[PDB]
Amino acid sequence: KVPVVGIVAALLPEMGIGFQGNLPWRLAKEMKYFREVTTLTNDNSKQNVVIMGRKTWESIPQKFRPLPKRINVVVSRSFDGELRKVEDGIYHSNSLRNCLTALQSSLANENKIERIYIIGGGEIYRQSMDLADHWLITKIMPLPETTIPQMDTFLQKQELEQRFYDNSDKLVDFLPSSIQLEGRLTSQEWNGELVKGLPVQEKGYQFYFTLYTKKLEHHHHHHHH
């Protein structure tokens, strides 16, 4: 019942997302978007979940984790069970898939989770293409005189474009109501590809907030008893 949304910032055209265990850039306006989207809810009695891999957890500055006002879930194969409270605001899971099933139980969550955000990293995102209902992707482009940063971790763009379509026309309506964005919806060609979303510029980069949604599926089978 709860939507599952991957959220990621990726550098075009390869969709690079990391280098040596960290982000390849430091963009406050992008972090602000990430913070506001994952924190805010339409219903004030609910919170969102943020699920992340162990390495991504380790990348967040210690003074800023667990991420405030969101239920944090860290997944590691060395953890105990599918969903265990380990500290205030922190759950541990040994399974991305089982943790999502556990988080979907209305008995366990009392319908007080609005959305489940998958917040990284590379290995987690690879496993999330068949799990997410949507992707919020910030598409980042170095401006003309900007050096392309070195990167060693990438979003699976092939799998994304196979399963999802660019639904950025509906981004504004998809985001929590109280969020405010500066830019207006724009379509721009960049190194061949069509980039559509809400634009921002910061330091040496231009970036677009985009929304990807699952493509329509044929009706092949519905389980009957």
Pick out the residues of the known binding site for NADPH.
9, 17, 22, 54-56, 76-77, 96, 121-124, 127
Q: CB-side exposure of 190: number of CA atoms within 13 Å?
A: 19
Which residues within the stretch 9-68 sit at the binding site for ligand NDP (CB under 6 A)? 9, 17-18, 21-23, 53-56, 59
No. of helices (H) and no. of strands (E), the chain: 7, 13
The stretch near ligand 18H (CB under 6 A) out of 5-13, 88-96, 161-169, 198-206 is 5-13
Residue 122, amino acid:
G
Based on CB atoms, which residue is closest to ligand NDP, 46 or 97?
97
131 is catalytic: no
Give residue 192's region: left, alpha or beta (phi > 0; psi -120 to 50). Answer: left
- 5, 8, 40, 198: which one binds ligand NDP (CB under 6 A): 8
Residue 170, amino acid:
K
Angle at 161 between CA 155 and CA 163, to 5 degrees: 105
Determine if 64 is a binding residue for ligand 18H (CB under 6 A): yes
Whose structure tokens read 């590379």?
122
Q: Count of residues binding ligand 18H (CB under 6 A)?
A: 16
Q: CB-side exposure of 102: number of CA atoms within 13 Å?
A: 17
Q: Are 155 and 8 in contact (CB under 8 A)?
A: yes
Determine if 163 is a binding residue for Cl ion (CB under 5 A): no
CB 35, min distance to ligand NDP, A? 13
23 is catalytic: yes
- 53, interface contact from ligand NDP, ligand 18H, Cl ion, none, CB < 5-8 Å by kind: ligand NDP
Q: Are 50 and 120 in contact (CB under 8 A)?
A: no
Task: Provide the token pair at 97.
Answer: 């898939």
- 4, 12, 23, 113: which one binds ligand 18H (CB under 6 A): 23
- 55, interface contact from ligand NDP, Cl ion, ligand 18H, none, CB < 5-8 Å by kind: ligand NDP
**Euclidean distance between CA atoms 88 and 46, whole angstroms:** 17
**Applying CB under 5 A, which residues contact Cl ion?**
35, 67, 95-97
Q: Which residues are catalytic?
A: 23, 30
Binding residues (CB under 6 A) for ligand NDP: these are 8-9, 17-18, 21-23, 53-56, 59, 75-78, 94-96, 119-124, 127, 153
